[PDB]
Amino acid sequence: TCPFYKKIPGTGFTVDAFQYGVVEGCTAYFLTHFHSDHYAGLSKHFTFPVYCSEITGNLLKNKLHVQEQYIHPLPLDTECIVNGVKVVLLDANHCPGAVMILFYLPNGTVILHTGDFRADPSMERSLLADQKVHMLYLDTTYCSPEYTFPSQQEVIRFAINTAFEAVTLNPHALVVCGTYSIGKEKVFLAIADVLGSKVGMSQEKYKTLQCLNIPEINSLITTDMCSSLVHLLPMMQINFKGLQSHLKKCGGKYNQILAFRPTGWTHSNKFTRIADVIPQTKGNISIYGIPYSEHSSYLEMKRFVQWLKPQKIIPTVNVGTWKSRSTMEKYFREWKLEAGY
Numbered sequence: 001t002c003p004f005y006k007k008i009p010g011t012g013f014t015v016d017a018f019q020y021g022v023v024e025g026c027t028a029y030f031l032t033h034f035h036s037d038h039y040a041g042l043s044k045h046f047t048f049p050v051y052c053s054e055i056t057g058n059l060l061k062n063k064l065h066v067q068e069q070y071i072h073p074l075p076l077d078t079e080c081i082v083n084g085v086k087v088v089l090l091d092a093n094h095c096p097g098a099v100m101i102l103f104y105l106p107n108g109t110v111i112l113h114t115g116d117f118r119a120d121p122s123m124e125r126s127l128l129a130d131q132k133v134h135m136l137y138l139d140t141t142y143c144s145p146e147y148t149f150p151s152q153q154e155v156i157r158f159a160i161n162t163a164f165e166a167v168t169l170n171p172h173a174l175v176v177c178g179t180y181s182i183g184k185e186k187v188f189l190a191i192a193d194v195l196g197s198k199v200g201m202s203q204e205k206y207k208t209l210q211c212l213n214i215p216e217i218n219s220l221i222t223t224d225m226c227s228s229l230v231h232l233l234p235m236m237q238i239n240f241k242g243l244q245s246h247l248k249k250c251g252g253k254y255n256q257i258l259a260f261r262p263t264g265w266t267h268s269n270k271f272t273r274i275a276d277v278i279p280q281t282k283g284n285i286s287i288y289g290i291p292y293s294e295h296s297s298y299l300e301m302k303r304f305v306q307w308l309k310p311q312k313i314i315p316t317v318n319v320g321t322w323k324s325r326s327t328m329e330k331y332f333r334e335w336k337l338e339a340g341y
């Protein structure tokens, strides 16, 4: 059945709750972003109002064929009324089109649902600064102190420098980048930019990127693989067998692959700095795992929560085991005692 952490009390609303059939008492279904664990259940047959960002509404219409009459896109940073309740959508610093949602309940309670987010000090200057938030529905993906990772900018600098050096040493090297969802487009776009190439990809992935309102996108991507030396492939194909096979398909245009797998966290983060990352190599194929995250590190999460000072936290991730739930609740209490709220 629908879990309680997907329901907004005092409303008829749910968040990211499309796989439970008709939810009893739901008058509006919000969708924070276009990732499959969150949209699971949507299709052209859905006939309830869906509230979301413009970009998420482009993907629902073009990729899932949801009918336009049921898609309700809202502008960001703007007070809107939905079924009698004031809401605001805020940028979540996740994937394109991903939002956080502020609900202003009729009784005076204010609720923030973060969806999936990567906390940032810039958020401390949005419309969140303007009033008190009583309850927080929190993306707790990496809520444990082992989870450190570098800034997105440091990771992009590493990838650009690595790729430019490799292709300048060997003009016959191909760069490949893995993907299985929207997000992390900076990785492949930044590498293609330094090399003076467009990114080549399948028709399906091109269609998906053309929904994202990214500026000057017609200048950066293409479905012509032959004209491109940065190729995107399914994350599943980023392994030695998959890559050897791809290289056969390029007809002797290239004699080396340098590939990137933008993972979330990996336990090489506990020891190894970004400056010291090395690839896995077989023959003329090298694979780099780079820690490009679109979720909060532990310290990032902790700073946001100690700034916001919520009265109650409701985790939305890692809620399935008692040991995870108990560990998270111990951290929330530490943060509250350290900061004095």
Ligand code: NI
Residues within 6 Å of the ligand: 033, 035, 094, 116
């Ligand atoms: Ni997500």
